[PDB]
Design a protein around this ligand. Structure first.
Ligand SMILES: CC1(N)CCN(c2cnc3nc(Sc4cccc(Cl)c4Cl)ccc3n2)CC1
Length: 493
């Protein structure tokens, strides 16, 4: 993900492309005018074009282009679909040459100001064999140190000096690298060997995000001090080029119109496969998400996917559905009404649904549904639809109390139902709000059964969920809200 530059301005992007790029070179960067948005900066015929990318919480919206689940999938799409990106006037913008960033601030292993002994205590406490980090040198300004743990007495910490000479980095001899990232990547593949023989293997960065549950308030205070939240979120975003798993089934011609957004697709390896269809009937835009409960993350139904939605719910034995959007928000349709009116009964293809009773709370409506296969009364089961209604049109809720009390009720419903399947969670595209609810539920469930004596690692949890559906958790404001929800839950114990 070298083409994303987290700390550059528009002017700096123009100069970088004009002095170090060619026609077809590109980078992406956060938008300094509109916080939370991003800009694609592309060079063409010796001129730079800036293309705005919005994310209000549901997807990345490329102005004059399509909607995507991550910046990496967006870049992958246009680099592999030439003449697909059109401009203002309608002319082709070619993304050909990523312009690599040299900034290490978004790398998991870069700690900046850190003493040799502070790094030793961190590596002693949370480090493993091959855990490493890079820090500024405390004696030679402008130089850095690579601190590695290999392995009382059986393990050690080795400090390797990295000198910076003319904006090139080296470990005292050999090759000179254009960035710390290149240096780390090289000595990851070609590990340094010590004179006496020890191999300084760079296996994984030192974890700094896993904390004890009781430490959340302190960590939140730290991140609240360009704030730590932004830095941690962007570092997580920098890992998304590891998650470009294939989505071939969703791109098939017969499945295209089963997607609310043509380029927001389920990974083939975790997609819910619909099994006994009408003699392509196996496709729905949905993924299994596994952390005790499992989830299905899915989009709001389209008119032509309501039948497939109920086949999924039936086949997977799901007994709880969590809907996190209104049907209509800001005059836009985000989910068709896939359930009957209270007391009514409808057939959706071969599936029959009765709306038994609705119960309203302030934050949500609960719909007691009875689902069965037509022609087979012995297949009936109750499906409890929790329709969250108070998520704001802009941003995230200011207080997590409503979301937390909602998930607490959903969790107890699920736990009270013997052998219930995954909980279905959906919004519009099924990645932003849907990922946020699912991540909070996963973290809360650890604390619910372990109290404060448990580790929580928010970005690791998100990355694990992002490997099972694209772009789970869309924004920094959602990232922050997840931390705020976890803090509030721990405090009300
Ligand atoms: C100052 C920093 N440069 C950025 C902030 N700060 C870090 C450090 N690791 C981070 N790591 C992640 S993602 C992840 C987390 C756990 C386990 C696994 Cl496997 C993954 Cl992939 C997401 C944000 C981070 N943020 C320390 C270094």
């Amino acid at each position: 993900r070298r083409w994303f530059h987290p700390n550059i301005t528009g002017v700096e992007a123009e100069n970088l492309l004009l002095t170090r790029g060619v026609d077809g070179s590109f980078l992406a960067r956060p938008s300094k005018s509109n916080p939370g948005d991003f800009t694609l900066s592309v060079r063409r015929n010796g001129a730079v074009t800036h293309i705005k990318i919005q994310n209000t919480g549901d997807y990345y919206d490329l102005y004059g282009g399509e909607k995507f689940a991550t910046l990496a999938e967006l870049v992958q799409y246009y680099m592999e679909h030439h003449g697909q990106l059109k401009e203002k006037n309608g002319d082709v913008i070619e993304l050909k040459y990523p312009l690599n960033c040299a900034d290490p601030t978004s790398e998991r292993w870069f700690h900046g100001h850190l003493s040799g002994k502070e790094a030793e205590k961190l590596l002693t406490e949370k480090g493993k064999h091959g855990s490493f980090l890079v820090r500024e040198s405390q004696s030679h300004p402008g130089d850095f140190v690579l601190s590695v743990r290999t392995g009382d007495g059986k393990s050690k910490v080795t400090h390797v000096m990295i000198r910076c000479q003319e904006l090139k980095y080296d470990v005292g001899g050999g090759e000179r690298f254009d960035s710390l990232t290149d240096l780390v990547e090289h000595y990851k593949k070609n590990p340094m060997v010590e004179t006496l023989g020890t191999v300084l293997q760079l296996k994984q960065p030192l974890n700094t995000t896993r904390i004890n549950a009781a430490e959340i308030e302190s960590r939140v205070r730290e991140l609240s001090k360009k704030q730590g939240f932004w830095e941690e979120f962007e570092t997580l975003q920098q890992q998304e080029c590891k998650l470009l798993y294939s989505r071939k089934e969703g791109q098939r011609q017969e499945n295209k119109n089963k997607n609310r957004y043509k380029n927001i697709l389920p990974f083939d390896h975790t997609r819910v496969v619909l099994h006994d269809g009408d003699p392509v009937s196996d496709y729905i835009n949905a993924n299994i998400i596994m952390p005790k409960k499992s989830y299905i993350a899915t989009q709001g139904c389209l008119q032509n996917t309501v039948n497939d939605f109920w086949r999924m719910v039936f086949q997977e034995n799901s007994r709880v559905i969590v809907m996190t959007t209104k049907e209509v928000e800001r005059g836009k349709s985000k989910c068709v009404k896939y359930w009957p009116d209270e007391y009514a009964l409808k057939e959706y293809g071969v599936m029959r649904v009765r709306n038994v009773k609705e119960s309203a709370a302030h934050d949500y409506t609960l719909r007691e549904l009875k689902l069965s296969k037509v022609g087979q009364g012995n297949t009936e089961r109750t499906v409890w639809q929790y329709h969250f209604r108070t998520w704001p049109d802009h941003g995230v809720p200011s207080d997590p109390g409503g979301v937390l009390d909602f998930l607490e009720e959903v969790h107890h419903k699920q736990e009270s139902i013997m052998d219930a399947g995954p909980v279905v969670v959906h919004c519009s595209a099924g990645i932003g709000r849907t990922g946020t609810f699912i991540v909070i539920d996963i973290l809360i469930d650890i604390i619910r059964e372990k109290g404060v004596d448990c580790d929580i690692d928010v970005p690791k949890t998100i990355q694990m969920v992002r490997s099972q559906r694209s772009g789970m958790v869309q924004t920094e404001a959602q990232y922050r809200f997840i931390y705020m929800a976890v803090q509030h839950y721990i405090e009300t114990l």
